[PDB]
Design a binder for this molecule. Structure first.
Ligand SMILES: OC[C@H]1O[C@@]2(CO[C@]3(CO)O[C@H](CO)[C@@H](O)[C@@H]3O2)[C@@H](O)[C@@H]1O
Ligand SMILES: OC[C@H]1O[C@@]2(CO[C@]3(CO)O[C@H](CO)[C@@H](O)[C@@H]3O2)[C@@H](O)[C@@H]1O
Ligand SMILES: OC[C@H]1O[C@@]2(CO[C@]3(CO)O[C@H](CO)[C@@H](O)[C@@H]3O2)[C@@H](O)[C@@H]1O
Lengths: 437, 441, 439
């Protein structure tokens, strides 16, 4: 009946090497589904179920069939980052130490070769409608990389959760948990992909859509990356929809586009500890960036307090290099220690247009305030307190900076005249109305 | 064991008579088997408990005190108990069915003592110490409080929204929880979660409950998405307090909560792209220093209750309250649609001009590009609920009604109000706020 | 089974490969026989779940669902582009890794319905009248496949007609709290048609290469269509609703080639917000027949030319004066949308016209604010290589357009920052206009 359970397959042992078990199942599916056109069918695929459990993976799974679903019964997330920064003598008193759910532990050496699941098939048609649902992929530990952070804080292990190498259509990744992977999810050459309602956190990079793609969506995810990685990344995508995500720290950025066109980054909650939250680069054009909530503030947790993404406060929270984009209805909260602003004496920048023409920036609210950077060892207490604290002085900021290399833009109701730094001769600027008469 | 349980395949007890006892027995088995936290890089992976479609009475509270427990069913099982309890009782035997169904947990607990609502919860999630309980999942089953009871309100008992029962109560600090695809019906409180971090309440059906979603204590980085929600007139549809970075989006919130969305001390959050329908003022309330929030591209409809049993029941608030009321600093109210569809004779107080957006306190609020449409209609009532409701929603033939689109109280200043009403429609001190009237002809 | 769980491959004497319809009907009869009493121990008709493992199942008998709380579920949406495959030369088929959709697959082998009886061609029909309304039926994570399109006198190749008389799911009766989630629909004349819906959720489906995808008919209320991937055919609807109040349409990625992306008739107090919409024809979003008090906000619209040869000369019959967004109704709100108009200046229809982006044909009190129009002139070219041609066209980057056209039959509108003065064609005496500032 094309239904398998990894704990009820006579070949191998999923506790020791679930990779071998799953590859054996896939070989069985192929052996039984050899003919493509028998009675209007022949290759319907299969479903492979992972009950809740701790499964070591020592052999990469190769998925080269369409319509394979791999499903579990728990995303299984717990903060390994918090736990590895608890003093080791306290670990015996903790209720648990590891992630759980339907848990695949990635015991591969260190980039597609370090992926727990590799989806690859060349030829025609494109591999289609593979589904990953409601299980946990855990890369266990981060390791030394010469960064000189403690090993468990490097976000480096050469491991990937799911890597799709080949052109693909109608794929789904839903309800997953990804934790402690250098890369959670990397999908090349995607068409009509849906990455929906996952929890992708404490991974160096979370979601990367590489090569090219079209007509895809990234919706309703909880996402948190590492300071040298991407939270959500796309390159050469057309018609991408990125919405209803709650992106929290500490990726280098929240959303990073290279050569992305005719796409929408709308209605997300985005929180970063560094500038450069949303980056439209390398001729990213005709995109809508609307009604997102941006918060940029300082890391409040001591283990990462001095760690950042190398970008200064002139970068912008939103940076655009490309033509004919639309930036409408966003909220930006800029909550920083004025003494720590880099470069020394700079006025921080919120929206920066570095290149391109015809960008329309309208109806954006910037709120900037000056607050001392607190540092505490208790992660979630420090995080919640920092989010709720509004004890602050108003801070002068540049709402919109148009560099001379970007021209013929339209900037409306996105800051006062002094807040909008731009050549009025070659841009259409309307300052937000002033108080009074 | 492979950590998978089915409540109809357990040796002891009877899930029809007391599924709570059965589930607690299963949880005890999980804990007995998963005692070690660090064996081969694991040891406490949790489990899944499956509820096939069926009618299951719960007479003992389920206590969930382990991480990575999933409780799942095969239906959300909603039917309108409200409509059925307002059909004359003598006609009940002729109806195709009466009760909710799906994978149905019937909450047969007594109400908890004063200040102990947790005792009336079918499922209580609680564990202290470290780390925080994490990644518990509730999926695709039905929780049914069965009846509402007499409470001194003067309403018929089944219309009180009172029974002291909760569906799911999370008492302890928690991380990465999920509540998805559920059906909640006829509970005084559907879902109450304290101290939530990175919670997702997604694609549920939470209706005919006194209060639906309440996020209490504090929280962060959570989301409430894609839900169908309808509460009762003394209760909350979506409530949060002391949350930062909450995202509330893609919900369809219908009557008859006291409010649609109610924030106390909520900061740096977004209430965006929801459809919100209320029968009373005070639909979206930002209170007690609720600051730096985005309230964008929502569709607000306020009209009069059209169903006879509730025609004269309301949330106590007059039409000067506002549909959206803000007490806090630096918020952003952008791109919303407001439909105010009321019978002028029914406006309270007598002869008042209704208020749409009210800024009661705070500075730096940015209100831009909001369309207000106000219509003077009649008070049509009908005994047939679905007929009355559809007829009222589709009826747009009406005369104009003068409203105050934006009211800025003296307690609020240094706000910016753009293209959200004509000069007459914006009642505000021009000296201390930045005001641009919507252009008119 | 006493526990109300059924697997179609375990049904005694059933053969779901030959006729899964007969199997599912037999299961429904079994459920009804066991669940006869409505009020025993505060219950009695809890419903059931029917599971379809991955497999190829022919349906030769319509399934009739007339009980509340029935869930039909599978383990795979199973989509593959039968459209691409049927346009690959037949001599190349043997080298293809697969030819057909899969997953938990219901192949609809029903004949077309009689005149005015399209419900007869539905694989699943949900119907029950009387009280209470049928409630909380769920369809989840399976594939419905109408296999082939057939000749219809259009002159297209048979597999490109989008015509077969088949429906995936047809709900005929008033309904409450229904769900359609995680489905795949392919090669059906109509994917999903739901009449008289209350508090419906159509969420996270893949509904493509169907003549029409989602149709909400009759009337309805308090429903939502969210997070779907949708692509229809040139004579049909992508998302259609009539006489709905309080509908929420959001977070959908609608790609070609429906006649429209979103089409409302008599829809009120609803929201079409934060969708990505891509069409090859004008008339992408249509608010018609007194569609009033709707929010149309922060959508991304792209209109360009079909790049794939088999459909290059096929369209929806509408010219470039139609508008990408057309409104006939009162008191709507059009806010924060992006429009990309990417067309061949030499081929604009009618000859010599200037394309229209937003058109108000009738009604009063519409508020149109803060919309960005981007228009460009690109030569229309054809190639036979579907996904290469499609991706290339999306990635490829002036033309004069009318951003907002207010016909004389619509008045008392407010148009702000949605076009230069030249780009707004409207009577200034009876509409309030603020031109986007220029340089
Ligand atoms: O609060 C959101 C999430 O934050 C945690 C805990 O906090 C962490 C610790 O590394 O720091 C960042 C938040 O600043 C997150 O990437 C990471 O993961 C989740 O445990 C929590 O779910
Ligand atoms: O229309 C959405 C929902 O409304 C019903 C029916 O109507 C009710 C009856 O109490 O009144 C309110 C709506 O005005 C809802 O809270 C409630 O529940 C669901 O039967 C229906 O799903
Ligand atoms: O790219 C989105 C979807 O497009 C396909 C392939 O392209 C098609 C072929 O008929 O043309 C339209 C898009 O122009 C789609 O309706 C249709 O289906 C899916 O294979 C693909 O998932």
């Amino acid at each position: 009946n094309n239904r398998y359970d990894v704990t009820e397959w006579p070949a191998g042992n999923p506790a020791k090497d679930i990779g071998e078990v799953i590859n054996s199942i896939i070989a069985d599916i192929k052996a039984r589904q050899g003919a493509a056109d028998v009675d209007d069918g022949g290759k319907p695929g299969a479903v492979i179920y992972l009950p809740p459990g701790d499964y070591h993976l020592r052999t990469q799974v190769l998925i080269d069939i369409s319509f394979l679903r791999i499903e579990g019964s728990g995303h299984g997330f717990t903060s390994s980052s918090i736990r590895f920064n608890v003093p080791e003598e306290e670990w015996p008193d903790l209720h648990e130490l590891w992630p759980g759910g339907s848990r695949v532990i990635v015991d591969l050496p260190a980039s597609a070769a370090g992926a727990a699941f590799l989806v690859a098939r060349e030829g025609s048609p494109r591999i289609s409608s593979v589904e990953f649902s409601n299980f946990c992929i855990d890369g266990l530990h981060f390791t030394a990389d010469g960064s000189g952070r403690h090993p468990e804080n490097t976000y480096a292990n050469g491991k990937t959760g799911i890597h799709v190498a080949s052109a693909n259509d109608s794929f789904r990744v839903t309800d997953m948990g990804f934790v402690y992977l250098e890369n959670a999810l990397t999908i090349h050459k995607a068409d009509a992909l849906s990455i929906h309602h996952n929890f992708i956190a404490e991974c160096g990079s979370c979601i990367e859509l590489r090569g090219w793609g079209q007509a895809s969506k990234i919706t309703d995810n909880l996402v948190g990356a590492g300071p040298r990685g991407h939270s959500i990344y796309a390159e050469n995508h057309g018609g991408l929809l990125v919405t209803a995500n709650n992106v929290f720290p500490r990726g280098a950025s929240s959303v990073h586009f290279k050569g992305v066109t005719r796409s929408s980054v709308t209605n997300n909650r985005l929180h970063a500890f560094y500038p450069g939250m949303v980056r439209l680069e390398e001729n990213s054009s005709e995109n809508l960036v609307a009604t997102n909530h941006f918060l940029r503030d300082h890391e409040p947790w001591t283990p990462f307090f001095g760690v950042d993404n190398g970008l200064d406060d002139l970068t912008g929270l939103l940076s655009i290099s490309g033509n004919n984009n639309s930036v409408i209805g966003n909220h930006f909260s800029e909550v920083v220690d004025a003494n720590e602003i880099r470069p020394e004496g700079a006025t921080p920048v919120i929206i920066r247009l570095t290149a391109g023409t015809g960008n329309f920036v309208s109806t954006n609210h910037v709120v900037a305030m000056d607050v001392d950077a607190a540092s505490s060892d208790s992660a979630f207490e420090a995080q919640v307190d920092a989010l709720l604290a509004t004890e602050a002085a108003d801070l002068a900021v540049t709402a919109v900076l148009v560099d001379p290399g970007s021209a013929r833009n339209t900037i409306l109701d996105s800051g006062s005249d002094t807040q909008v730094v731009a050549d009025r001769a070659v841009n259409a600027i309307r300052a937000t109305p002033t108080v009074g008469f």
